Ligand binder design. Structure first.
Ligand SMILES: [Mg+2]
Ligand SMILES: [Mg+2]
Ligand SMILES: [Mg+2]
Ligand SMILES: [Mg+2]
Ligand SMILES: [Mg+2]
Ligand SMILES: [Mg+2]
Ligand SMILES: [Mg+2]
Ligand SMILES: [Mg+2]
Ligand SMILES: [Mg+2]
Ligand SMILES: [Mg+2]
Ligand SMILES: [Mg+2]
Ligand SMILES: [Mg+2]
Lengths: 317, 316, 316, 316
């Protein structure tokens, strides 16, 4: 424990409270697709995984099925593929160690057309090979490269413990880009069936970078509780920025909240003349925040109890 | 044309002079390896390409051979593979139009273990498969992802021609990350044989983002002449930053000079306690600037007059 | 009451016997899927419906789950989607009254993208939006149009009491087309996964009209006991044909039986060269008859005494 | 060409002669409202369509303006809305290929609230969402479902060419129901402002079935020349009935003529006690036949010049 890291429940809750109204977050209404859960169950059934891998897989799939809420106006292919790749990613940012060295040569075996060192890796590679079901060419390439980046980032995510982060460096953002896997979902925000890349890609591409900034910086705002205060992840993006800039993690959370603010501002600017484009990501962002809050089984935001400052729905002298 | 986009030869030379003196650029002594050029000629013969693709390949190989200079202290594997991927990437950034719809389905075809839509893409993918010859797993993966990004970025480079950059956006850096291909050479800076990822990856990785910034931004400083003043590229990083921030192109050029300045400062900061790594990338950056100056064929820096540093040993 | 309309249990049982012997109806074996019932239970659980509609939905779900047997060769998506739309349609054909007037402005709110005046209609519209899970584009269009027809027909089903159906007209078939909802189940016999429209639309489309005639007429035949003999529905297709053609109800029943006979024959003719398509609707029709019989909850066929046939009877 | 399909001009003229005298058709007096054509021109100006989609729109609107004659005693809302939907329907029935695959996902996008794949499709969706200007709830639902049927029918219509209407089947009527789009005009025969559904629907709904029969079959009779004799369409309803029953198209024309005869007689029967409705649909039928004759730019019914006997005129 070091004082330049820890943030109290009251302070973290206050940062969340300001962050929500800074972007005017209203919790979106519940979303229930009856097809997603049995479809993903059938998917897990079809895979040639070992036991304790499917047993854990169902446990993680209960979380994964909520990703379909992120794309309410998208076709079934978009939502189900997003849920499937969400399940595959959750199996990694949780259980990447149960495969050992298998992930280190995923990039080599993927380009060489060879079966992977682990079965789950072959499942992931086959999803990368079928990305064209719901995406365009550029989107498929980005999903492949973002999966490569995510696998290698999670492999080397923990290598910088003992405050390896030297000091003056831009490296926390580089590491967070590698570990984020944000671009995969950023491209599914504008699916190729609703918005074909042919016309709409030049419209939504200038907004993609702030979209991925928003995506990455929110598993760093909303999961900062689950991994740093409640856990021990001292290598997450907030802790890296703190270890390199000297600032406390509390200050870094305020910085990141204001960052998501500014990114949202410029997102509204870019997609303003294209109301349906903007509406798609406006649905996506609220569903993202919602799924982060509701999934207490992974992010534990319910345990954050602090003081209130009752507004009494009034302000009288 | 528009006067807002034009930077005179005087101005561009002044920017090059102050850029070189800000980072203390001594023009390095020339690098010669007798093995690189015949090896690359052998490679082009070995490639089952069409004619006029083997011929322009020789024309580009003249430019591509010199990149072994960027990695002096590295094995023949590092320098030769760098030269090979350079010939491939030069061919693409010049003549990606010649392949039609071949490049757009490269990515998926690569992950499915399929033959490519064009033979040149097959050669590129085969380079991606033998990056382990001189790199570790992390480096190989980064090369693969940066190659995918470069192919798609060059394909979608000129889509934004019709003053598409809306206005308030981080997009220019996002596009330059794709078109820049920087991470490949950045990983080649610290080879797996000399500094294996087993002990040195945690040492050099926190310096890759500034190194990629330096690499991306220098072909935007030194190649700004070949593509914007002499040429017509209005969709490069400088033009996009100017098109989105409203600033003049000259302003953004001096901004990027200061950017590479600060990145070099933090590179020296990061790699101070490991002198061998710092020397490796210092060699790389000096040779990179040198290669841009020498290659008047591609960058035309003989037509602009500018200053470097000298220490009363030009007589050597 | 009226003597022209009453059909004795002897008469109705005899008509059922001859109807099943005309089309060679073996009583099908039971179909069990463990997944369908709790899945529909969870579906009802997550609905934003009220109580006394969730409880009524639970009561109807026992009847609704049987529709999965109509598609025994189909994937789970087809079967369960059919079960859910069946649950909604069963809710409506009985308790359409309990939603006031929300059905009258259902179509406008659906096309306008407005949330419905009732939440049950919201669930129904969401099913209309996710028809793509198991159907092509033509099938989805047909399901939407058929749902609109069914809702408006059920809302105007009983507007023609007091023997409104005037004298001489083709109206009964038109109204039974509206209230039949048959096209939704017809397009589910050949789903998009097993027989994509891509190749099979031109093969099974000329067979939908007789299939929908069978579906429409067999509720009228096998529920005529539950709605007219044991009940009071005097505006169903049989009673309308009676009130308009002057023939007795007992006449119209066997007219309809001969009609389904002639439809089944031409269904066999059209689908002869495609044994896969043929077997699918063979299974559908057998299970449809079986569900009508076994659902004594709503059709009460256990009270009449009629005859199928079998030869190897013991089985299991 | 095949002998089973071609009708000689004398034969077709005789068929049309007997058809006209069977239904007692006196060509109605010319109709004109100065408001309509400039209003539709303003509407086409309002549309966000491309050029040559607006250049063709002016050409088709000249055909489409005459539809206001079909509803003389109706308000301007009914007449102008029918004219607008007629213009959209003509545009799609002629140039559905020009929109690519936009129509195939018209229904889903319509119920998901998403914008259409073509601007014209969004214009059509707006008409569907505002059908309540001149109709009741049932009429709006019928128009929406009939438009979905029309779009998918026009898509899949020619998919049954090359003689694949198998052999034994009810399919030609099933396809002509979808391609006909007849219900949209049939409901406008009894508009909601003059005859609200609040009272009159139980009076006129039994007459809708033969009215749609009349619309489909009358167009099939009067357009048979322009599409099968003069043109090339071998997938219209007449050719389909011929290809399934084995009859000649010459035969099927007379079959359909007598069918229209019967439907007209039963229409006169249904609306006998309600003369207000009977006069309205009489107006519609006269105007519909007349408009088929007048619009020689589309149906070319002036070109049927054929020998005929000469009678004598009495009352001397
Ligand atoms: Mg983690
Ligand atoms: Mg991670
Ligand atoms: Mg995290
Ligand atoms: Mg270039
Ligand atoms: Mg480039
Ligand atoms: Mg350049
Ligand atoms: Mg009923
Ligand atoms: Mg009903
Ligand atoms: Mg019934
Ligand atoms: Mg047509
Ligand atoms: Mg036509
Ligand atoms: Mg016609």
């Amino acid at each position: 424990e070091d004082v330049r890291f820890m943030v109290s429940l009251s302070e973290y809750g206050a940062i969340l409270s300001r962050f929500f109204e800074k972007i005017d977050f209203h919790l979106p209404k519940p979303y229930y697709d009856s097809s997603i859960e049995p479809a993903l169950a059938k998917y897990i059934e079809e895979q040639p995984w070992s036991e304790d891998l499917k047993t854990r897989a169902a446990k993680y799939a209960k979380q994964a099925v909520g990703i379909a809420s992120w794309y309410p106006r998208a076709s079934f292919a978009v939502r189900f593929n997003c849920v499937v790749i969400t399940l595959l990613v959750i199996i990694y940012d949780e259980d990447y160690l149960t495969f050992g060295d298998a992930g280190t040569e995923f990039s080599l075996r993927l380009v060489r057309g060879l079966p992977q060192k682990a079965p789950f890796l072959d499942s992931l590679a086959q999803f990368l090979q079928n990305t064209d079901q719901y995406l365009g060419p550029y989107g498929s390439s980005m999903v492949i490269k973002t999966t490569l980046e995510f696998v290698e980032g999670t492999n080397v995510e923990n290598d910088f413990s003992e405050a390896v982060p030297p000091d003056a460096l831009r490296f926390p953002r580089y590491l967070r880009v590698k570990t984020g896997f944000a671009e995969t979902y950023a491209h599914a925000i504008f699916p190729n069936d609703t918005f074909p890349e042919h016309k709409y890609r030049k419209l939504y591409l200038p907004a993609l970078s702030p979209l991925c900034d928003i995506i990455d910086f929110t598993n760093d705002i909303l999961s900062f509780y689950k991994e740093t205060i409640r856990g021990t992840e001292r290598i997450n993006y907030i802790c890296n920025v703190a270890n390199t800039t000297g600032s406390s993690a509390l200050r870094c959370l305020q910085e990141t909240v204001d960052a998501v603010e500014s990114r949202v501002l410029e997102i509204h600017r870019i997609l303003a003349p294209y109301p349906d484009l903007l509406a798609h990501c406006n649905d996506y962002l609220a569903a993202y925040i919602g799924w982060h809050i509701r999934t207490t089984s992974r992010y534990f935001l319910d345990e954050v109890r602090f003081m209130a400052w009752v507004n009494v729905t009034e302000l009288v002298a």
